[PDB]
Structure formats: structure tokens, C-alpha cells
Design a protein around this ligand. Sequence first.
Ligand SMILES: *[C@@H]1O[C@H](CO)[C@@H](O[C@@H]2O[C@H](CO)[C@@H](O)[C@H](O)[C@H]2NC(C)=O)[C@H](O)[C@H]1NC(C)=O
Ligand SMILES: O=C(O)[C@H]1CN(CCCP(=O)(O)O)CCN1
Ligand SMILES: *[C@@H]1O[C@H](CO)[C@@H](O)[C@H](O)[C@H]1NC(C)=O
Ligand SMILES: *[C@@H]1O[C@H](CO)[C@@H](O)[C@H](O)[C@H]1NC(C)=O
Ligand SMILES: *[C@@H]1O[C@H](CO)[C@@H](O)[C@H](O)[C@H]1NC(C)=O
Ligand SMILES: *[C@@H]1O[C@H](CO)[C@@H](O)[C@H](O)[C@H]1NC(C)=O
Lengths: 336, 116, 507, 106
Amino acid sequence: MALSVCEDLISSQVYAILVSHPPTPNDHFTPTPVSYTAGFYRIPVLGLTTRMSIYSDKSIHLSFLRTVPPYSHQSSVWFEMMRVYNWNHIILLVSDDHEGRAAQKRLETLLEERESKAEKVLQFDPGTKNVTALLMEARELEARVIILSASEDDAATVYRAAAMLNMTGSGYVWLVGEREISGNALRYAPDGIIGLQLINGKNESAHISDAVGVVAQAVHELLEKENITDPPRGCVGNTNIWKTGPLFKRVLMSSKYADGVTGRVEFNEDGDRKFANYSIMNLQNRKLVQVGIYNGTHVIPNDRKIIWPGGETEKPRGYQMSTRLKIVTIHQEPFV
Amino acid sequence: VKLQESGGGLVQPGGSLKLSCAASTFSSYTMSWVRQTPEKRLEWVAYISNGGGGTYYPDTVKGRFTISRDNAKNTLYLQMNSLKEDTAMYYCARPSRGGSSYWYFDVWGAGTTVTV
Amino acid sequence: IGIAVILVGTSDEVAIKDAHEKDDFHHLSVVPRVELVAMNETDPKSIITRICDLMSDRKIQGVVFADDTDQEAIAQILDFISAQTLTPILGIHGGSSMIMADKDESSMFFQFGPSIEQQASVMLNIMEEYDWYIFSIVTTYFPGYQDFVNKIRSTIENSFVGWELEEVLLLDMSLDDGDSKIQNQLKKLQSPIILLYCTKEEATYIFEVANSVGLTGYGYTWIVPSLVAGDTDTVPSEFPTGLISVSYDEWDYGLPARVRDGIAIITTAASDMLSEHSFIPEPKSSCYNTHEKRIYQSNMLNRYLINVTFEGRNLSFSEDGYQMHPKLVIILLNKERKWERVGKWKDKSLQMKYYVWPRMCPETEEQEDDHLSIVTLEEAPFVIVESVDPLSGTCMRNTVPCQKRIISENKTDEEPGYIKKCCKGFCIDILKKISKSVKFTYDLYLVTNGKHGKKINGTWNGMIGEVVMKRAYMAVGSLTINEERSEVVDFSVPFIETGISVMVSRS
Amino acid sequence: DIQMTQSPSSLSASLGGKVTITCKASQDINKYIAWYQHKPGKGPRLLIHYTSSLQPGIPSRFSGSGSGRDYSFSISNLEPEDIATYYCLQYDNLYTFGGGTKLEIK
Ligand SMILES: *[C@@H]1O[C@H](CO)[C@@H](O[C@@H]2O[C@H](CO)[C@@H](O)[C@H](O)[C@H]2NC(C)=O)[C@H](O)[C@H]1NC(C)=O
Ligand SMILES: O=C(O)[C@H]1CN(CCCP(=O)(O)O)CCN1
Ligand SMILES: *[C@@H]1O[C@H](CO)[C@@H](O)[C@H](O)[C@H]1NC(C)=O
Ligand SMILES: *[C@@H]1O[C@H](CO)[C@@H](O)[C@H](O)[C@H]1NC(C)=O
Ligand SMILES: *[C@@H]1O[C@H](CO)[C@@H](O)[C@H](O)[C@H]1NC(C)=O
Ligand SMILES: *[C@@H]1O[C@H](CO)[C@@H](O)[C@H](O)[C@H]1NC(C)=O
């Protein structure tokens, strides 16, 4: 990729590369060299089908803007769940993965901007097949709702453990992320879990057209603006950073792409679509059926009844009153 | 810097004779030497690093040769004990780039004979 | 083992002589063959082609690089090379000296500088050293600041002494109205010490705002890391007089020493691996042939990269890949606009070039000495001096630091610096009351000869001698009123009475 | 310590003739080949680095083929002034020498 973007593109004098997700989702390192070569003079990338939070960290991926937010943004999609049913006790469990801790850091900030607290932070390793102790110490707590968007095998193992044991009844309900719902963890899925899904998440034509329009608007503004020098005509001789990088990143930040294809395709300070629309698939008899719509500010349920885990038709109990109380004290007269 | 050998000779049968090759800074440059077989074959004798360590020998003179170096006089100190059946002619050499490693060398000595 | 040394700058063969031509590289089955390749360029194409040629054709497994450019993206370019070669890489100087992001699990690239938490801890140690618990924080929207302030907090409450964090600031320079919004909290700027987080281009604007408002006055001490200040030689005109920064040792710790220590650590790690498993992990066959299942071959190498001991010093790195004992230098830019090293940090030891706080008097008029020089002689219960509690760094709040004088007849050629000890007293109570009433301060030190003062053949000594020679501006101590002193100093209004008294047993 | 042997330690040639010596290394040198010579009183001289590496003051008539474990060093139309003996030396573990090869002229 480096060699192809250098032997024919950087002498084409490319102003904005375009990058898509790697074919084999075993290692997501295809966009890495191209972000490299963009950012070596700090030219931003147009990420198109990318959802990883390792490029979301503007610390060095400040030359990167995506059209769809990563999975870490969907933490806010969980935050509005707090408004749905008023469930004050929520657990946090996360694997050793960059996406995992980005998403738990950002949901922690979310729950902290409304004076709220989680209940226990759990840090397990991905790929492990013995999650028995962690599940034990998490189920004994008042938490009846879990949440994690991680690798599929951990998903699957949790599902198997909840299946062998008694945690699929009426009361043990929780939410699930994006990709843990397609595959083995969909075979081990319960009857009634709910999850989020992207509108037009497969049709790359709308996203491509939206990004072509964004980039055309940005280049038009730039070229109609003050004087501009040239990008490196080649991969030889030029040393110093490009002065056009500041102006281009400023233009992209201020980009008003109100003429979007699939809605108001306008981004944020970290290039992430705002007022995002997401469908809500409930697992009605293993089938993903829409029972809600996210518009960006609220979440409105649909006309079909939400089938709950364990076979409920009403609001599941998310947290209970611990009737059994535990007391400790110092032995001292005349009180003990 | 130029290398000049001295202390060539094996007159005493069964003895231990000291060969040396002085240099004219040479303190940070490693040094080696080559013995000449009666069949003219060039053979390694002993190895010293630039710091004096790594005193190893090939599978022919292992465990019977004593070797040392001194950078104050830029000299090596080799004892011959088991070269009785050899009218050898050793010559010293300084590998380039110094260091503990080994490279290709061109600065060569003068040639001193060893006779019994 | 093939080693490649990338040269970008004025470095010459003297570094080669100092690096490998002085240490013993034995105990390795294969001799380390080192090759130096020099280029003024950091353009990706040439360097990646050169390293690919050195990797496939020559099978080089060691990477050593240093330069003299402020380009920071090359530090993580090295990280990409590590990801593409599975060979250890070390950053030393210039573009390979500052901090790095995207710590990669498959990469084993290490850097010789300080890790973010390391300069955080060093900065808070300096903060404790100058014992002025009032401070503010100015931080831009440059990412990575959240973890920095998180660890600053974690440590500031980890030490449960009574700190005082005024405010934490988030700056938005992408909006012109952002600065106007920032002015509101800039109105809340009263702490003399502000901790800065920004880049260099953001720094220029920050200094511009600071000196436009007038934050260059007395007591305003600024401490910035190496990233904020950039390179020491490049001094922007926005730099205020008396500006203090913290960076790595660039003068005493020369580059040849750095590369020698790095290659020694590399040799030690290679020997440790050879003892661990006794096989040589062959490098990749080609740059296009990435090894997926062979990661475990190099990961064991990484297992010895964090912990390496060299020359009896703990030069080992940490989990993120940064030397746990770095030689850090705190430098000061004075009115002369020259950078002078005024603080050192090495081997868990912190040393100040000035025991007393250096006088960073700005280029302002008046320059009245609000910090009056005060000397006193030990006389209980007027003076009670005790050793400063080492665990707490100071003593309890009512005590004041005072200086044991610079006298040692054992070696008069070397001046034994003043010794800070916590002291209390009624006189000190009067002094703090008058200091809070008149809004001024004072420095406390000890009389040289341990005497109030006497006219030794006309020349006064002791406290009276210090006052006469203007060494001590104002005087503090339980000294009565004498006519001889009256002719040489001005006696103030007494605060307590005394005289020729007689005491008898109560019986 | 890595060892090495040389073959056939013999040559049959005159003022004209292509003489080839086969270096049979033991460990994978990955081009670590070296070719040396010596005189009985003129003073030895450096001849050949890696494959066909030209050197100042050195004729380029020497040729090399093969790699790794097997090398072939060929000399074509040698002069009667440099009548000496050649040696194939490498370096993997410290130094790795061998028996060597001869060269005699009728
Ligand atoms: C993306 O959506 C567009 C718009 O619908 C699709 O384009 C046409 O869609 C209609 C109705 O689905 C089809 O009858 C046509 O055959 C489509 N033409 C094209 C361009 O294929 C497009 O197919 C969609 N692409 C994906 C990946 O679903
Ligand atoms: O001004 C001073 O120097 C001190 C001296 N002190 C002297 C003590 C009495 P005597 O001198 O020993 O007889 C009294 C307090 N003031
Ligand atoms: C679940 O509950 C059922 C019904 O009471 C019981 O038979 C079964 O043992 C329980 N399973 C576990 C794993 O506790
Ligand atoms: C120095 O820079 C020039 C200009 O790019 C380059 O041609 C040359 O190769 C560089 N020198 C070195 C050390 O290669
Ligand atoms: C590993 O670290 C420990 C810390 O106590 C140290 O004693 C030891 O020498 C280190 N080992 C190596 C091989 O560096
Ligand atoms: C002052 O006089 C004394 C004796 O009264 C003498 O010892 C001392 O040295 C003199 N001081 C000076 C400075 O001359």
C-alpha cells in the first residue's frame, strides 16, 4: 500500500486519500500505512468503512476523519438507555483491547456528566475460555444488566456460561454491541436480547458519494481561499511539513455538509456524524426485528412489542433490594 | 599504524616461547595473527577482542596456548608450547573498524621466522 | 547479528569509536556486524527501500537511529518499521527522542526519553521542592491531555498533604471566539505557577496571550516539558524572561554515550534470549512476507527488553518502553536569553543548582525586595529549629524553612550549601503577622558566627555585622538595645521589655 | 565453534588456464565469503570481497558463483608475477578457517 500510494499517487499530488476496511478482519492494519503517509506532512485521511477506536485517538491520528463513528461512540447510545427505563445499577466489563477501554472510558465520562456511577469495573483478557470466576463475582452483585462490545469468542463464552447456568430468566436482561451478534455468539444467543444496528452500514455507495462531496467542498473552499503551495510532487527531496495541512484540517473541521445523501451528514470535532440514526433489533425468536429507532437525540420504540429475555411483555427488573444484610463491628463493651 | 613482529624462535624443545607484534593509537583496534604450516597453510592460532576478552582457540591448539594483550605498548603476548614439529612463520594483522567483532583487514606486518 | 545505524545530521565516526570500539561484545555466538548508513532525508520511500534491502538481502535485526530534527512523526515511523520487521528499535536523539503514541502490542520499539507519567512525577516533585502549593493548569485540546491530567490528579491525591489545585483549563484555538471564551477564566489567573500542555505552534499563541495580559511579572514561574518548548536552540520571541523547561540531558549526556549504552543493552538482551531459548529468530524473508505465527519468536525477545541492567545502573525500560531511570535536566532561560541547566534528576535523586530558590526577577521597574533577607541566632524559645520531616518533605504549616549557613572549616574550598530546616518561634509569629499585614515576605537563614554581634576593632560581626554590610536587610532576634548598635543601625519599637533583673529562690 | 573445510587443495595449470576453487562452508554465511593470499617474503595482499567485488589496484579477472553453503571462485588467465596460494576464509563464530587450496606452476 505504501509503495502504491507513493509510486503513482504522491506524484499525482493527491490531496485526500480514500480508505476502506481490510478484507480479513484478523488484523486491521491496512489503513495504517496510508494514514502514515498522509500524516507524515499531516494531511488527514478520509476513513470510509472504519469503526476502530485506534484511529479515533486524534493524538497521532489527527490526520483522520471517518464518515461513521466507531463503536466507542455507541456508548452514548447506551447512555440514552439510562433514560428509557431508569436502571441505576449497571456493571462494566471489558476485555484487554483498545476498543474496549476507549468505550469504557467514554461511557465512564458519560455516566460522570450526570453525577452517576457504575458499580464494578472488570478487566478480563480476550480469547480466554475460563470466565467462571469473573461471571461468579459479577452475578452475585445487584447488577442484572451487562454490557460489552468486544471480540466474539468472549461474547460466546459468556453466553455459554449464562446458558449452562440460570441467567437467561425473566430479569437477566442486557444490551449487546455490533459485531458480537453475527456468528457463534448468534448461535448461543438467548431469546430476547436487544442490540443496535447501522442504517446503510453495508451500502458503500452513499458513504462514498458523501465523502466525494465533502472533499470537493473542502478543496473548493481551500482553492477559493488564500494562497496555496503544492503538495510533495514525489517521495524524494522534500523534508519539512506542509503548510496547507493547517488550513485543510481547519476547513474539514468547519465542514458543513448539509447536502448529505442519507440525511444531515455533518461531523463533529473528531469527524463523527451527528444526529446518527440506528435501528434497534430485538431477538424475536432468534430473528432481528426492529423495535426502536435512534434519531440522534432520542430513541422512539416501534409498534412491535419488545420480546424480553426469559419471555416477558413488560419492563424487566434491572436492580433489586438486597434484603439480606451483612454487618460487622468491633467487640467493645457495653455495645458488643 | 604499522605492525612489526618480534620474538620469533623455538630453539628449546618442549618449551614455551613468547611471540609478540608491536604497533606504531591501536588501543581500540582488535588484532589477530596467522601461522604458516610447512605445507604453507594459513592457520588461526588465538583470538582476542578489542577489550582483551573472548580468548578462544580453534580445535587444533585448544587448551594448550596462553594468549594476552597489552594496549600500553600495543603488543600481544602468545606462548608457543606445541609447535615443535613446525618451522612456523607467523604474521600479525589488525582488523579494521576495531571493536570486538571481525572484519576484512589489509594492514599486514613484516614476517618473523620460528626455528628449532 | 546485523545492526544498522541510521545517521541524520553532523554525527561522525567519533560516535562509532565511542560506541562499539570500547566495550566487549563477546558471549554471543554470532559477532554483531554493524553498518552505518548516512542520509539527510526522512522521506519514507528512500528509508523504507534501504531498510527493506538491509532486511531481506542482509538480514539486519538491530535498529539504531538518531537525528537532529523536530519532526515527531518519525518517532512512530520507527514504530511502523518495528511492526513490519519484528526487530527491536531504539529511539535516541532528535526526532526519535520525544514521546510516542500508538503503543503497539506487536511492536517492541523503545525510547530513551521520559514517559508521560515520568515527567508528570518529576514536575510534581519539583512542585513539592519549591513548596508553593498554589498552582493552575493551562492545557490545550491536543489529545492525550486527559490521561496526563488523570495521572496528575491520581498522584496529587496519592500524596495526602494539603495541596491546592486552582483550576484545570481546556483551550480551543480552532475558534476565534474560543480565545474570547478563554478570557473569562483567564480573569481567574492568580496562581504564580501554571502547568502548560500544548504543542509548539499552540505554545507561541499561549505565550502571546500570556505576555499580552501581563503574566511575566515577579513570582510567575513557568515549567514546561520538552515537547512544549521544542528545541532549546530555537528560542521564539514569545518566550518570557526567566522561562524554565524540563527535557533530557543533551549536554552532559552526549550522543555517543547514548548509543553505547543502547548497544550494550541490546547485547545484554540478546545474550539473555540466547540463554533463555538458544535459537536465533531468523528475520523476515521479504518486506511483503509478514510473519503472523512467528510473533512468539520475537515476543520472548521483548520479555528481556524491559528489564536490562547495565554498568550497575538500572537503565531498564518500563512496560510502555521507557527507561525507568532517565537523566532529566531542568534548564532556565534568563534575561540573557541563553539556556542554563539549573536542575538535575538521575538515579532517583533530584539536585538543584541553587539551594535557595533562584531569583527570577523579571524586567520590571521598582524591583523592591519583598523577600527581605532575615538572619537569626538560635535562642530558645525565641528560635526553635528542627529537622525537616523527610517523609513529608516539610514540617507542619506553622513552621517556616530556614537555612543553616554555609560554613565548613574541613574544606573551605567547597562551600557547603545552606540546609533547610523547619523552625518556629514567637519572633517568627510576629514576622508572619507583619508579612500578612504589609503584604511582603522574608527569607530566613542562620548567623555565620553564632553571635548577636560585637565591635571587633570597629568592624561589626554577627547579625550586626550582616546588617552593617547590608547582607541582612532587616534583623530578627532577641537582641536588646545598645548605644553602639544605635549608631550603626536603627532600633525599632520594642515588642517586649527586659532589663537588669534579679531572681531568688521562692523558698 | 563453527568449522569449515576446503577442497580440493590442488590445481593443475600453467601461464594460461581457468582455475576454480570450491568453498564448502558449514553454517549459512549469507555472503560472508573472503579470499586471501600470501607470499613467502613479498607481503600478502587483499584480493576479493563478496561476489566479484572490485578493489583498487586489483585485477577484475576474478569471478565468483554460488552462495550460502557452496561457493566457486574462478581465476582466468593468471599472470606469472602473482604466483602464490589462495585461501577461502569466512567469519560466523569468531573466525572460521579451513585446509586451504594450493596453486603450482610447471
Ligand atoms: C444502495 O442503494 C441504492 C439505491 O437503492 C441501490 O441502487 C439501486 O437500488 C435499487 C433498489 O434497491 C435497485 O433496484 C437497483 O438495482 C440498484 N442499482 C444499483 C446501483 O445497484 C444499490 O443497489 C444499493 N447497494 C447496495 C450495496 O445495497
Ligand atoms: O543583644 C544581645 O546580644 C542579646 C544578649 N543577651 C545577653 C545575656 C546577658 P550577658 O551578656 O550574658 O550578661 C541578652 C539578650 N540580647
Ligand atoms: C436453575 O433452576 C432450576 C429450576 O429451579 C434448577 O433445577 C437448576 O439446577 C438451576 N440451575 C443452576 C445452574 O443453578
Ligand atoms: C544530504 O542531503 C542531500 C540533499 O537531499 C542528499 O542528496 C545527500 O544524499 C545527503 N547526504 C547523505 C549523508 O546522504
Ligand atoms: C530484572 O529486574 C530486577 C529488579 O529487581 C533486577 O534485580 C535484575 O537484575 C533484572 N534482570 C535483568 C536481566 O536485567
Ligand atoms: C583590633 O585590636 C585587637 C586588640 O585589641 C587586635 O587583636 C585585632 O587584630 C585588631 N583588629 C584589626 C582589624 O586590626
